[PDB]
Amino acid sequence: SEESQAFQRQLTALIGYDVTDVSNVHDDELEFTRRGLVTPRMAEVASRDPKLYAMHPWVTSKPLPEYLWKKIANNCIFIVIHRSTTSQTIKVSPDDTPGAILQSFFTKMAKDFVLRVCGRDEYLVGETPIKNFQWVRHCLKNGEEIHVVLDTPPDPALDEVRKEECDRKFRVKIRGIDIPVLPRNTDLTVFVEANIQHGQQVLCQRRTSPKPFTEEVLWNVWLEFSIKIKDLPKGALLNLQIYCVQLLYYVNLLLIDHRFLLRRGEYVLHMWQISGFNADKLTSATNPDKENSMSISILLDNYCHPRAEMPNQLRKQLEAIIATDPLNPLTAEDKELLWHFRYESLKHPKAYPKLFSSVKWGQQEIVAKTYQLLARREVWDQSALDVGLTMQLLDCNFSDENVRAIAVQKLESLEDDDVLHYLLQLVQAVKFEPYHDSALARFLLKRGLRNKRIGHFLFWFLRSEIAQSRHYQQRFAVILEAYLRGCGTAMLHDFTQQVQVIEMLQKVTLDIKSLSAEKYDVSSQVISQLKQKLENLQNSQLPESFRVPYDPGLKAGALAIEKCKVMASKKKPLWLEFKCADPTALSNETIGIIFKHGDDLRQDMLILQILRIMESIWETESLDLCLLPYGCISTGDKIGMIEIVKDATTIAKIQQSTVGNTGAFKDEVLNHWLKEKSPTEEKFQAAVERFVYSCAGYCVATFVLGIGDRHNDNIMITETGNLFHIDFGHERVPFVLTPDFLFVMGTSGKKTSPHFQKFQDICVKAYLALRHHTNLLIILFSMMLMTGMPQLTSKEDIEYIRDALTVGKNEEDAKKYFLDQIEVCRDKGWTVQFNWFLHLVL
Ligand SMILES: Cc1nc(N)nc2c1cc(-c1cn[nH]c1)c(=O)n2C1CCCC1
């Protein structure tokens, strides 16, 4: 067909990769996954409610924080319904369903339709109380009034989907290695290390005789392994690595294919290089660059087609191992204890990661026994979903189909609200899967196709990696295509517009970087070029309206060249302001987006996502630490978009303003900046209240994630007291609590005050609230470093969180430690702040 071909070119433009390309492949796994993904796609597409899908209500089943009821001692929530110019308020109960609200409006004024939010593409529909809608909850947290325009429901016909159409020991021959260009260092020797890895664990290791590092190094060696072919587990990788000792290149080949067949034949594998552990080292993908990359020649001539009662102190020994942290290492003694008493271990869902890692995957008998254990699941299936525990089974330590599936089975219970909270880390967890088609990938696909909101972010998260990861672009592309093949023409159209706008704006940011590279000033010659480039695009290129990638509810239209500016950073970022495409928008505020090139925004995406997970933990204990986890999406190679937080200034800009500059910092400026920016002394005290909470929040979050020690330049504050850290792109103070912050808190030097007692109290509640979910945080942290950052210590770097979360210690010793930390920041004052300035000169 020709319309099947024209649509495939549309999918390729959306993906940023061609899924039909067979040039960097040595098997049909990517094709076989494309076919494989049709069934779960169509099933979900066939199962969806067209009314609800088109309207995507963003709802929750979580209670409603104490701290949010205090906004209603009246049991009355006010909603203002709009038509053309007419607007009328309605007295609503928190449990009032939107259905009851429509026949309370039509009743009141008597002498089919849907409630859409003013300015946004969000709707208040379905069988849920208005207290249970995320937008209403935002209006309550922000003191805002619920403006809702009464209009016709969107046509579910717009969301239409276009119809688709042997006991022999294992051995590998290392023929040789070839690189077209060698010139670098001296002439150090080179050998090939062949590892049978499964769940990051090395089952068997075999090296070659060291030979001279030339442009072609032939060995013609058969590497005999101890492992038998029947004993090889599905999901095992032949990990081929090159050492000079030091590691230069790696490549992995899956010993067993997607059709359970044993890999047999001749392979010329183009290898990835290391810079002079992480998710990239696990990839089955080969380096697409055949011209510059190192390759390995290999040959596979391997054929095939494959009660009692626990003692008191042993039960206690087992329970002590099960109680331990995820980062706690297991002894051969602990493993034998977990395994021998596996049926007792099975009774504890929290023992699962330790138990499933305790398995000897290199033994066909043991794996069958493990498969026998998972059949008696019962205690697992009945356990309350523990995402922390579930995510733990989806990391690098688990390379088994069955173990990984039981964890995915647990994620199904999640409401759309919680899926959004973990989506990024769940997509990032696909990197850990041995195979392209997996339960996790099908889970993500299913969930994305069922909710537009999840589907939007799924697109962008998949796109973020397909554009920057040579290691996983193929796999993510195959899943993106699957998603795009069932999301609907409505969404395919919005995505088309978003991609076009972002591609255009990316060009401008790069072109503007050329004009003044690292010299900081921003000449009117550059300001004119940006202004011309913007008006030149607006005229006949940029579409009339695009969906905001970091906030799909907001639709952005026309630019505002007058507010658009290039900025003073060494990397020249674009500050772009837009008119809200929506005519029913209650305000006149623009949509602000910071298009920037320079840093890897993928790390920032991950940091912001944990920040939202900490906010939700805090909600479970009725704490609101007023964080601002701003919109941030990585669009391509070291390029992306940041959300512009309205009425905000940098902490350094405020100190700078009253002159002094050269390391000079006055403790009073922040307080005067707040008083000056607040029209009434109520607005001022509310801002000090906002500062106390936001400050405590960033202090805890920051310290826990190890991104505490920051420059003034990188901490911002709103005109309304709300503090927030920015740019998490890559003496020591645990966090930023400087004398200027402490002065807003009242306190002057080594003293005490009512607002500081409050601040100290909120830190302890917040820190303890985090510690209640130690394992959750430990796993996300670990995952974030493996899938987002460069090279990382499979202990050191990761163990930071454990030490920072003060694992093992009681609630009193933990509170002391955090209050000690606060004092370190007090003692040093401006020491570190001035120290950054000093480093510019010395
Ligand atoms: C969220 C936000 N709001 C405002 N309103 N200005 C910001 C930011 C964030 C960042 C940011 C950069 N990298 N990562 C984040 C930022 O630089 N800014 C400003 C633009 C120039 C300096 C201050």
Curated annotation (Swiss-Prot):
Alphabetical keyword list: Angiogenesis, ATP-binding, Cell membrane, Chemotaxis, Cytoplasm, Disease variant, Endocytosis, Immunity, Inflammatory response, Kinase, Lipid metabolism, Membrane, Nucleotide-binding, Phosphoprotein, Serine/threonine-protein kinase, Transferase
Activity regulation annotation text: Activated by both the alpha and the beta-gamma G proteins following stimulation of G protein-coupled receptors (GPCRs). Activation by GPCRs is assisted by the regulatory subunits (PIK3R5 or PIK3R6) leading to the translocation from the cytosol to the plasma membrane and to kinase activation. Inhibited by AS-604850 and AS-605240.
Cross-referenced PANTHER family: PHOSPHATIDYLINOSITOL 4,5-BISPHOSPHATE 3-KINASE CATALYTIC SUBUNIT GAMMA ISOFORM (PTHR10048:SF34), PHOSPHATIDYLINOSITOL KINASE (PTHR10048)
The keyword ATP-binding appears for this protein: yes
InterPro entries per UniProt: ARM-type_fold, C2_domain_sf, Kinase-like_dom_sf, PI3/4_kinase_cat_dom, PI3/4_kinase_cat_sf, PI3/4_kinase_CS, PI3K-type_C2_dom, PI3K_ABD
Coiled-coil segments: none
Name recorded for this polypeptide: Phosphatidylinositol 4,5-bisphosphate 3-kinase catalytic subunit gamma isoform
Organism per entry: Homo sapiens
The enzyme's E.C. designation: 2.7.1.137, 2.7.1.153, 2.7.1.154, 2.7.11.1
Family according to the record: Belongs to the PI3/PI4-kinase family.
Catalytic activity: a 1,2-diacyl-sn-glycero-3-phospho-(1D-myo-inositol) + ATP = a 1,2-diacyl-sn-glycero-3-phospho-(1D-myo-inositol-3-phosphate) + ADP + H(+); a 1,2-diacyl-sn-glycero-3-phospho-(1D-myo-inositol-4,5-bisphosphate) + ATP = a 1,2-diacyl-sn-glycero-3-phospho-(1D-myo-inositol-3,4,5-trisphosphate) + ADP + H(+); a 1,2-diacyl-sn-glycero-3-phospho-(1D-myo-inositol 4-phosphate) + ATP = a 1,2-diacyl-sn-glycero-3-phospho-(1D-myo-inositol-3,4-bisphosphate) + ADP + H(+); L-seryl-[protein] + ATP = O-phospho-L-seryl-[protein] + ADP + H(+)
Note: Candidate target in therapy for inflammatory diseases. Selective inhibitors and protein ablation are anti-inflammatory in multiple disease models such as asthma, rheumatoid arthritis, allergy, systemic lupus erythematosus, airway inflammation, lung injury and pancreatitis.
Region of interest called Catalytic loop, as start-end residue ranges on this chain: 706-714
Outcome of substituting K596R: Loss of kinase activity. Loss of autophosphorylation. Reduced inflammatory reactions but no alterations in cardiac contractility
Phenotype when changing N835S: In IMD97; loss-of-function variant unable to rescue reduced T-cell activation when expressed in Jurkat PIK3CG-deficient cells
Function: Phosphoinositide-3-kinase (PI3K) that phosphorylates PtdIns(4,5)P2 (Phosphatidylinositol 4,5-bisphosphate) to generate phosphatidylinositol 3,4,5-trisphosphate (PIP3). PIP3 plays a key role by recruiting PH domain-containing proteins to the membrane, including AKT1 and PDPK1, activating signaling cascades involved in cell growth, survival, proliferation, motility and morphology. Links G-protein coupled receptor activation to PIP3 production. Involved in immune, inflammatory and allergic responses. Modulates leukocyte chemotaxis to inflammatory sites and in response to chemoattractant agents.
The PI3K-RBD domain, residue ranges: 74-152
